Amino acid sequence: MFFINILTLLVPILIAMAFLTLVERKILGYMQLRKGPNIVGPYGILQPFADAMKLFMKEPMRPLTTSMSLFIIAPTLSLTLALSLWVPLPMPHPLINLNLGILFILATSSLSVYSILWSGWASNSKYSLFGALRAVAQTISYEVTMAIILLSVLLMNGSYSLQTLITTQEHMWLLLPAWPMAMMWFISTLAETNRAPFDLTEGAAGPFALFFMAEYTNIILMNALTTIIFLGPLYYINLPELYSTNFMMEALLLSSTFLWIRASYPRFRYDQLMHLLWKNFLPLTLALCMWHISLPIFTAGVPPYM
Amino acid sequence: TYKYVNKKEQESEVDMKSATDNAARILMWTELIRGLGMTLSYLFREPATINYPFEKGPLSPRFRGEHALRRYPSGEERCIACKLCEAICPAQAITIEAEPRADGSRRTTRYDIDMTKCIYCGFCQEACPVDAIVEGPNFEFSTETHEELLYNKEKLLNNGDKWEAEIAANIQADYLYR
Amino acid sequence: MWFEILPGLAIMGVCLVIPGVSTAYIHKFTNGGKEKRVARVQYQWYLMERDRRISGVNRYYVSKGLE
Amino acid sequence: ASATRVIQKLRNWASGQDLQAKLQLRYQEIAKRTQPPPKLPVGPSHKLSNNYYCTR
Amino acid sequence: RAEYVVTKLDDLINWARRSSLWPMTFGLACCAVEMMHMAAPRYDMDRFGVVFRASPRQADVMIVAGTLTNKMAPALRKVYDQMPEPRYVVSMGSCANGGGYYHYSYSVVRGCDRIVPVDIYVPGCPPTAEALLYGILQLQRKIKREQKLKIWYRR
Amino acid sequence: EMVRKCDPHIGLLHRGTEKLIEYKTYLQALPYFDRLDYVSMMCNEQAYSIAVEKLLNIQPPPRAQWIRVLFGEITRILNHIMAVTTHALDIGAMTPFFWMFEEREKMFEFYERVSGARMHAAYIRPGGVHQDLPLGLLDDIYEFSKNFSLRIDEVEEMLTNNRIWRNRTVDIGVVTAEDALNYGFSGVMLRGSGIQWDLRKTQPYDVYDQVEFDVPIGSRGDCYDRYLCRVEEMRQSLRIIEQCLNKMPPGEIKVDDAKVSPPKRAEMKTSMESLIHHFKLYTEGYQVPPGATYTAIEAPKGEFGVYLVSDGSSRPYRCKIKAPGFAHLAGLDKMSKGHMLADVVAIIGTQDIVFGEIDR
Amino acid sequence: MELVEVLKRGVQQVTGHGGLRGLLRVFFRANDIRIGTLVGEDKYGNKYYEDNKQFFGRHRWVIYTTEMNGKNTFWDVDGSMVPPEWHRWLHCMTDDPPTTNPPTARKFIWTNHKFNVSATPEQYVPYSTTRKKIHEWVPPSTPY
Ligand code: SF4
Ligand code: SF4
Ligand code: SF4
């Protein structure tokens, strides 16, 4: 069987993402010196199912604005990628081995843009057209680092296959050899999935569930995908279930981390952001995706292809 | 005394001792940590929230809220139609048409507040030379209708026939004080 | 207080442990106690499809015992 | 209050200054309600002599 | 049984409805400020599932704080026919109820109710944040009582 | 992409207050001035009383003058907290907002205990002050004020060396000094460009004469040096408080004259004359002389002032309110020239649009 | 130890409210498990616990009871309750509750507080309480 396994991949992340939307409000309260939800249930745990059932009773917003065969796709497309964006992601053994999986992430991660464009082009609003377009060049100039920062790292790894990284992280984490990559990686995780200090879609009305469902979904992923690449947890194959249990807390730290950001800083004024990724990171970055290519050439040895 | 908020720009011969400390304040980010690690303190602090209907907050006995017509300790409605508790009411909120009481005495036939007027300013509780009108600690009297706030007088007695157990202790700590 | 978030975390925190430990055990139930036996390159396939052609079509078994 | 003599060092290390003494909110030793009733002062011109309205 | 259960459903339909509602808190005036003191720690909104700043077009409720001029009114009602149609309404302030001060003035509306319906009126010139926070709960049982399918069954 | 020409539509909250006072007497019109700078109440009342007190020719007593300064620079602390933080919200920072609005609600209670209610405190009347303040109030300001110089620098740890703040804020809305005066900002928005000026020291009126405080001038005109002015003006209340706290004189309130202040409520109730005045104060009122003034006071905004105009009738004759923001906003479309959207948000916060001033 | 002392202190919090029903009730009722010294227990069940150690807005909390004047006050809990002698104690206006210094009977006060009736019957309706201010005419039923 196999259906039984995706049954243990989707519902065990959709529950998770929902309790992020809660923990979001619970931390940031306590960041802001206040309890969050307490009366929806025991300790706010029952907020999301309530908020969920709220939106899915939303009275029929008049479907303006297009042949609605495109207002159907923008949410249904982006959420669809995210649930697929997890599949190769190898908790100790992946659901799906991919020899090029780390590269399968970017496309699926980057193809989601058409949700933000088509909702911007469908939405016959002279402002939101070029209001949901800043956010696209935003997401795109971000995408470069998301590859280079990912690429130059895998230079001193073997193939693109994510199963390798567990082996490469035997005695050591990739956090130390490239702490800069991780820095430029981390913002490149905030970068796409705007839920970050920079938002630029908060300064797509009726089916707000799906963006609200996919946005936070990619968070737990792209935090997780940072752990599995840099903050490598421990595999030690006779009790592989440990790895997942250590894979947990790093994903929660990296995700508790984001929430400390939004309750740390303000937005970023979309001209700096380019200036940040066309003067400061990318020129800094190429030297690193020139450094690691000389690295094994210099050092002694280059990793394999299994 | 005038104080320059921001006057520190002076060419201090920026050397590698210090000029890189700014580069230590940069690429190896520290000021952002400094702004982050602060916030992390508060989540380990005591949130000052309170479970409102079970934990209501602090007031003081001079709180300006809902009105009420007091009464003497021996029946006898304390309001006597002076007609300066509207002449001062800046909202122009009030109409207190009056008559004799059929006892030969002097009282009202009318008394009014539009509580959607009535800024809750406090001129009337103090202008009343008798403390016949007062302004008591109720602030949960929101209703679903603009009409149920137009308190006439029978509500505004039987309200004053309710909190008199309370007002006569706040005012007990507020006479000899205004 | 500071710890009433943990019912948000530890519930989430016993959510993603499942697809790591389960999918381990979902594979090991099928494949017979061993793992999925990944196939990255072609040579990992001949050995497999060879082993497929040794017994009942499942491929996680017969070893020595014959000769 | 219930600060377990560790998180104080986590707060202060994470923030700086010893701030259990200058904490955010208030507990005790403040405004012990129902202070006694005061006999106010009086203003001037309660003097009964050389007190007209012309000189005020 | 049918009618028994639908009653037990409507207690659940109107629960998710009320347990997390998304306002569109206007400013406009002094009255605005108390909501922020109600967004503050002490009388927090977010403890009820009430969100601080939500967009109008996905809102579930309106909260009118302040005076309401004859100029702002179209800009107001334009919003009210852009919410969905569970939209509930809350009129903070003596200036929105009936224009407490400036009832009699000319660039002013003599009550938000003159323009839009009202599910709850709330008094105070500066209604205390709590003094709203009971009212917002009074809204949160104005609809726990109301039954949509219980009567649709009889339709 | 970029802004060149912007135009506000300042009318969306007008009410006719200047008209609506003409049909109401002075005492009957006081709380309208709490509404204008709805964030900072007393300082409006602090001015309105003076415009009366000039005409009536009265200095109120010291103890009432004295407390009129105290709240007169707690209200200073409010609007800074309301436009330091809201200038951070609409720029994006939502946290210090909530850190303060418990610290701010401890600052309303010190109206609620003193005045009737929390916010629209009709506490400062023309004849000094209505009502003395209680016993369990002044031991409380010490604890509060002690813990409060931390809460700011607690924040200044976080923002005033923050990249996301500084380059979002610095070089922004460069105001030329001599051009401000052509526009008459006359509040923070000129001292933040180096025009050394403050009425509290350049035209002192109340007991500010003996306080030993300072004016935080801003050079390098930009909304970060306005910001640092707005911070340090919060701090240098506390030097003023500490000096406005430890030498309060015992004295009188609600000026000795019963024609310009209501009398003691226990004293209207036996002494006849105090009853009649109580019956005519609160119906007819002062009966000012005719005349005219242009008062002023630097609120957090700036030169808040009133051109009250009188007549022998008890009621006024076209009061007028000088909304200091009213000129700051006319300069909105000159200081945002060669700048894009996102900072225009910041421009609003660093012009302090507490609309009610702007609106009438 | 340190940590365990909290749990030697945080465990009676749960096992200090009688049984489990008495505890689990409070939880869904108010989500406030804090051991409190009792001073009140009014008519119709308002308890008014207390603990001076917590901060300034939680040192006094009231637990309403069910069965108000026909309303089933388990879920639907108000603040328009708390009749006019504890309201002044709960909002920290004073220190002394109304057991050692209760209010003074005046032989006309209500004997049972009615809460904020929102839209039910038993609510307010306005009048024109002015005795009609005119007297028109009456025809004589005697034709001509
Ligand atoms: S409320 Fe007071 S002032 Fe007004 S009519 Fe009654 S007794 Fe006179
Ligand atoms: S409190 Fe002020 S506005 Fe309200 S009725 Fe009394 S005098 Fe009028
Ligand atoms: S009701 Fe009072 S506080 Fe509210 S807007 Fe009007 S004047 Fe301001």
Integer Cα distance of G11 and C5 in angstroms: 19
In SS3 terms, A107-119 reads as HHHHCCHHHHHHH
Integer Cα distance of E22 and E136 in angstroms: 12
Place of tokens 């051991």: G35
Consult the annotation and say whether E112 binds a ligand: no
Closest Cα to residue F170, out of B23, B6, A187? B6
F228 and F218 in contact (C-beta within 8 Å)?
A: yes
- Say yes or no: CB of residue B93 within 6 Å of ligand 2: yes
Residue type, G107: K
Bridge partners (DSSP) of residue F41 are none
Q: Give the length of chain F.
A: 360
Nearest CA in chain E to B59: E128
Instruction: Give the CATH number, domain containing residue F165.
Output: 1.10.645.10
DSSP F199-255: HHHHS--SGGGS----B----S-STTHHHHHHHHHHHHHHHHHHHHHTTPPP---S-
In SS3 terms, E62-86 reads as EEECCCCECCHHHHHHHHHCCCCCC
In eight-state DSSP terms, residue D20 is: S
Integer Cα distance of B169 and B175 in angstroms: 10
Integer Cα distance of A143 and A188 in angstroms: 8
Its domain, for residue C38, covers 1-67
Q: Separation of E125 CA from ligand 3 center, angstroms?
A: 5
Q: D2-28 burial, b for 16+ CB within 10 Å, e for fewer?
A: eeeeebeeebeebbbeebeeebbbbee
- Helical residues (DSSP H) of A72-207, grouped into ranges: 73-85, 101-110, 113-122, 126-129, 134-155, 163-168, 179-191
In angstroms, what is the resolution? 3.9
Q: Which domains does chain E have, with CATH numbers?
A: 1-155 (3.40.50.12280)
E131 and E99 in contact (C-beta within 8 Å)?
A: no
Going by their DSSP bridges, the two strands B133-136 and F128-129 should be labelled as: unpaired
E95 and E29 in contact (C-beta within 8 Å)?
A: yes
- Say yes or no: CB of residue E91 within 6 Å of ligand 3: no
Closest Cα to residue B31, out of D26, F298, A94, F156? F156
F356 and F17 in contact (C-beta within 8 Å)?
A: no
Place of tokens 């036939």: B109
Cβ <8 Å between B122 and F122: yes
Cβ <8 Å between A16 and C5: no
For chain E, list residues whose CB is within 8 angstroms of any CB belonging to chain G.
Answer: 42, 130, 134, 137-138, 141-142, 144
Bridge partners (DSSP) of residue F305 are F322
- What sign does the dihedral B100-B104-B106-B109 (CA atoms) show? negative
Nearest atom (ligand 2) to Cα of B123: 7
Which technique? cryo-EM
DSSP F304-351: EEE--B--SSSS-S---EE-HHHHHHHTHHHHSSS--HHHHHHHHHTT
B159, B160, B163, B165: CA torsion to nearest 10: -140
Mention every residue, 6+ apart, whose C-beta is less than 8 A from residue F38.
E29, E30, E32, E33, F354, F355, F356
Question: Burial level of F18, CB count in 10 A (0-12/13-18/19+)?
Answer: middle
Helix (H) / strand (E) element for B162: namely none
Tokens of G76: 């639907």
Residue G133, CB half-sphere, CA atoms under 13 Å: how many?
A: 7
In eight-state DSSP terms, residue B6 is: S
SS3 (DSSP) at B163: coil
Nearest atom (ligand 2) to Cα of B119: 3
What Å distances lie between residue A174 and A231, B14, B122, CA to CA? 7, 36, 69
Mention every residue, 6+ apart, whose C-beta is less than 8 A from residue A212.
A21, A55
Consult the annotation and say whether E31 binds a ligand: yes
B37 and D14 in contact (C-beta within 8 Å)?
A: yes
- What sign does the dihedral F11-F13-F15-F16 (CA atoms) show? negative
Integer Cα distance of F252 and C44 in angstroms: 98
Helix (H) / strand (E) element for D31: namely none
Place of tokens 């508060």: B42
Residue F92, CB half-sphere, CA atoms under 13 Å: how many?
A: 26
Helix (H) / strand (E) element for B108: namely strand B106-108
In SS3 terms, A212-281 reads as HHHHHHHHHHHHHHHHCCCCCCCCCCCCCHHHHHHHHHHHHHHHHHHHHHHCCCCCCCCCHHHHHHHHHC
DSSP E17-67: HHHS-------SSTTHHHHHHHHSSTT-SGGGT--SS--STT-SEEEE-S-
- What sign does the dihedral F257-F118-E119-B153 (CA atoms) show? negative
Phi then psi for B99, rounded to 5 degrees?
-160, 175
In SS3 terms, B9-76 reads as CCCCCCCCCCHHHHHHCCCCCCHHHHHHHHHHHHCCCCCCCCCCCCCCCCCCCCCCCEEEECECCCCC
Bridge partners (DSSP) of residue B134 are B68
Nearest CA in chain B to A32: B42
Residue C25, CB half-sphere, CA atoms under 13 Å: how many?
A: 10
Bridge partners (DSSP) of residue B67 are B135
| Number of domains present in the structure of chain F | 1
E38 and F104 in contact (C-beta within 8 Å)?
A: no
Mention every residue, 6+ apart, whose C-beta is less than 8 A from residue G115.
G68, G71, G78, G80, G81
Mention every residue, 6+ apart, whose C-beta is less than 8 A from residue G7.
none
- Which residue precedes each gap in chain F (C to N above 2.5 Å)? none
Integer Cα distance of F111 and E94 in angstroms: 20
Here the contacts of A75-80 (C-beta below 8 Å, separation 24 or greater) are A75/A115, A75/A207, A75/A209, A75/A210, A75/A211, A75/A214, A76/A210, A77/A112, A77/A114, A77/A115, A78/A112, A78/A115, A78/A116, A78/A210, A78/A211, A78/A214, A79/A210, A79/A211, A79/A213, A79/A214, A79/A217
Count Cβ atoms below 10 Å from residue F348 Cβ, excluding itself: 19
Going by their DSSP bridges, the two strands G60-61 and G49-50 should be labelled as: antiparallel
DSSP F257-312: -TTTS---TTTTTTSHHHHHHHHHHTTT---PPS-B----EE-SSBEEEE--B--S
In SS3 terms, chain G reads as CCHHHHHHHHCCCHHHCCCCHHHHHHHHHHCCCCCCEECCCCCCCECCEECCCCCCCCCEECCECCCCCCCCCCCCCCCCCCCCCCHHHHCCCCCCCCCCCCCCCCCCCCCCCCCCCCCCCCCCCCCCCCCCCCCCCCCCCCCC
Largest CA distance in chain A: 66
- What sign does the dihedral C47-C53-C55-C60 (CA atoms) show? positive
Phi then psi for E110, rounded to 5 degrees?
-90, 60
Q: Quick one: how far is CA F146 from the chain centroid?
A: 23
Q: Using a CB-CB distance cutoff of 8 angstroms, which residues of chain D are in contact with residue F264?
A: 40
Computed on alpha carbons and rounded to an integer, the radius of gyration of chain F in Å comes to: 21
Q: Is G119 on the interface with E (CB under 8 A)?
A: yes
| Number of domains present in the structure of chain C | 1
Tokens of D27: 């507990």
DSSP F97-113: HHHHHHHTHHHHHHHHT
A197 and A261 in contact (C-beta within 8 Å)?
A: yes
Tokens of A205: 């009305």
Consult the annotation and say whether E30 binds a ligand: yes
Secondary-structure percent of chain D, ordered helix, strand, coil, rounded to 5: 15, 0, 85
How near does any CA of chain E get to the CA of F6, in Å? 20
Closest Cα to residue E46, out of F284, F335, B47? B47
Nearest atom (ligand 2) to Cα of B135: 1
Q: Give the length of chain G.
A: 144
F288 and F26 in contact (C-beta within 8 Å)?
A: yes
What Å distances lie between residue A256 and A134, A198, A202, B65, C2, CA to CA? 28, 17, 21, 44, 14
User: Helix crossing, A101-110 with A134-155: angle to 10°?
Assistant: 170
Integer Cα distance of E29 and F274 in angstroms: 38
Count Cβ atoms below 10 Å from residue G131 Cβ, excluding itself: 10
User: Helix crossing, A208-227 with A47-55: angle to 10°?
Assistant: 140
For chain B, list residues whose CB is within 8 angstroms of any CB belonging to chain A.
Answer: 27, 29, 32, 35-36, 39-40, 42-43, 45, 47-49, 51
Phi-psi region of A155 (alpha: psi -120 to 50; beta: other; left: phi over 0): alpha
Best probe of the A interface among C3, C6, C9, by most A CBs < 10 A, is C9
B52 and G80 in contact (C-beta within 8 Å)?
A: no
Q: Is D2 on the interface with G (CB under 8 A)?
A: yes
Q: Quick one: how far is CA A185 from the chain centroid?
A: 11
E23 and E119 in contact (C-beta within 8 Å)?
A: no
F343 and F172 in contact (C-beta within 8 Å)?
A: yes
Closest Cα to residue F84, out of F213, F240, F235? F235
Mention every residue, 6+ apart, whose C-beta is less than 8 A from residue G83.
B165, G42, G113
Q: Is G116 on the interface with E (CB under 8 A)?
A: yes
Closest Cα to residue B156, out of B91, B96, B88? B96
Count Cβ atoms below 10 Å from residue E8 Cβ, excluding itself: 10
Residue A133, CB half-sphere, CA atoms under 13 Å: how many?
A: 12
Nearest to E141 among G57, G76, G80 (CB): G76
Bridge partners (DSSP) of residue E121 are B143, E91
Q: Give the length of chain D.
A: 56
Place of tokens 């609605």: A68
Tokens of F248: 């309060």
Q: Quick one: how far is CA F285 from the chain centroid?
A: 26
Phi then psi for B66, rounded to 5 degrees?
-70, 145
